[PDB]
From a paper:
The majority of these studies have focussed on the immunodominant response through the p17 HIV Gag-derived epitope SL9 (amino acids 77–85, sequence SLYNTVATL) (6–23). Instead, in the face of SL9-specific CTL pressure, HIV has been observed to undergo preferred mutation at positions 3, 6, and 8 in the epitope. Here we use structure and protein biophysics to deconstruct how HIV escapes from the well-studied SL9-specific 868 TCR. We add to the existing data by providing the first ever TCR–pMHC structures in this exemplar model of how HIV evades engagement by host TCRs.
Author numbering:
A (entry chain A): 1 to 276
B (entry chain B): 1 to 99
C (entry chain C): 1 to 9
The structure:
């Protein structure tokens, strides 16, 4: 199937004393593989998956060098933005940045992206074409004009279409036994009596990867959303994911209801029905 | 500019009394990122709790997983306690094994 | 691998 590499960066200013907190995380698909935390002892980019541990010292030295450069960019950006928005030195503010690349089923470049936010709102982002910028306000508009004249999009596009994809393909191969494996959801249904006359059926999907999944309830072969509840997909902590969907039904009518599970790891969607 | 956390408290594996497991508190949808999350056993903070590295969703809101090993029993009550600038008091969500 | 030439604001 298709694959992505993404890096996420967060910097939070700390007015009372010292420098911003900076946290960077790298993912392949839904697997974290690297991290940097300004509060941690190593002051290095660190491995978070076994398949990245084989990279040699040149790699770790380079990633550490780059990630520190990102940290210092975010530190000056916080100051630039405080000035652009006429804010005082007293309050904490946040920058967030995400970038990376998607490949399709055949490993060719599909999409790239680079987005930046201030205080949890859009600031500036590269357009899908990787050629121009979407600026949310007049501060970001001044950023856009500067970055246009300096050819910032062009240099980012070359990374996103080129070296980003190349590294993604390298990681997919090195990590193949997990990164190129789908884990289909392990599914079951529970039943609970809610009153004398009603019951709750809950359809569980467990231990799946990747995270993307769809759970839907049908009654008499038609989709039902009334009297349902669907929890957001949550990490199990072992690299897989979990989700459930529940429906309240008249006691005795459980057989009319079916839970439908769609996932990349299933050749065909599953249908579950209450059978005890 | 402020978004309150969503909270789910759950075990890694289907819980069986007396068998070692992991207790998870998944906090998501919040901004800004500073947040206090504790796991509690019978009202008391568990010391050996770890968490995931801060990341965020498309809407820029943050998410974190907090977790610890634990061994459920019939009588021990577990919970997650969350404080955040959007909450006037810490919010306690109890662990329910069917959820 | 990280991008090598991030531009500041």
């Amino acid at each position: 199937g298709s694959h992505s590499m993404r890096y996420f960066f967060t910097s939070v200013s700390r007015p009372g004393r010292g420098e911003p907190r900076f946290i960077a995380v790298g993912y392949v698909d839904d697997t974290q593989f690297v991290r940097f935390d300004s509060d941690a002892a190593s002051q290095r980019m660190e491995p978070r998956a076994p398949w990245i541990e084989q990279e040699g010292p040149e790699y770790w030295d380079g990633e550490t060098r780059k990630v520190k450069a990102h940290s210092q960019t975010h530190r000056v950006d916080l100051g630039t933005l405080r000035g652009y928005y006429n804010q005082s030195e007293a309050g904490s503010h946040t920058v967030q940045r995400m970038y990376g690349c998607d490949v399709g089923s055949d490993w060719r470049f599909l999409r790239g992206y680079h987005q930046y936010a201030y205080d949890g709102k859009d600031y500036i982002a590269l357009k899908e074409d990787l050629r121009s910028w979407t600026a949310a306000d007049m501060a970001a508009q001044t950023t856009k004009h500067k970055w246009e004249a300096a050819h910032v999009a062009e240099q980012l596009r070359a990374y996103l279409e080129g070296t980003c994809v190349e590294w993604l393909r390298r990681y997919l191969e090195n990590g193949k036994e997990t990164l190129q494996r789908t884990d289909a959801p392990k599914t079951h249904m529970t039943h609970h009596a809610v009153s004398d006359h009603e019951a709750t059926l809950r359809c569980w999907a467990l231990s799946f990867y990747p995270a993307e999944i769809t759970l839907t309830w049908q009654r008499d072969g038609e989709d039902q959303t009334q009297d349902t509840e669907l929890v957001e997909t949550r990490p199990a902590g072992d690299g897989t994911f979990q989700k459930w969907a529940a429906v309240v039904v008249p006691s005795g009518q459980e057989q009319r209801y079916t839970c439908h599970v769609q996932h990349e790891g299933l050749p065909k969607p599953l249908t579950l029905r209450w059978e005890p | 500019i402020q978004r309150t956390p969503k909270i789910q408290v759950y075990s890694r594996h289907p819980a069986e009394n007396g068998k070692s497991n992991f207790l998870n508190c998944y906090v998501s949808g919040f901004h800004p990122s500073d947040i206090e999350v504790d796991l509690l056993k019978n009202g008391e903070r568990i010391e050996k709790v770890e968490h995931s590295d801060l990341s965020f969703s498309k809407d820029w809101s943050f998410y974190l997983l907090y977790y610890t090993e634990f061994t459920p029993t019939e009588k021990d009550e577990y919970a997650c306690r969350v404080n955040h600038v959007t909450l006037s008091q810490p919010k306690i969500v109890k662990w329910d094994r069917d959820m | 691998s990280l991008y090598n030439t991030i531009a500041t604001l």
